[PDB]
Amino acid sequence: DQLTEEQIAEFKEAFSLFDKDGDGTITTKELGTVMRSLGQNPTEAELQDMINEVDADGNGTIDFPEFLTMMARKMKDTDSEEEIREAFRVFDKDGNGYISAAELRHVMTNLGEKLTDEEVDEMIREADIDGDGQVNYEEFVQMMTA
């Protein structure tokens, strides 16, 4: 059923974490910046490859539809769990199976987001189905699905 207004806002939030200058386009420099913030080390040719896979208009940057297309391909076939587990590990830095409030704050700080203790606690609450104050792997998965 129908793409929803809230779904769109979620995608727009993700786009804004890349598009830090809010000019409406994601460059290879912006892609690289976010990826390195998340502990990755892509090469220039790898960033170009990412953009070329979805650069429908050939202008060398990513616009909103092209960004959605990137996402749709990523989210398509995740049953191996390889990709989801890689993303979870970004957050679960100590590898203990639970994303703590401190761990979430680390990632949000790396992404350039200023948040209060109360804001981050509310984020945990959103994902924290079992109420234990931390986000496990299944809870993380459910945040993408849900």
Partner: peptide
Amino acid sequence: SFNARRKLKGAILTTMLATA
């Protein structure tokens, strides 16, 4: 008002794209 669900979903989606 700050929407924690949107914020966390946006960050998760970003991290998924930033993966191999």
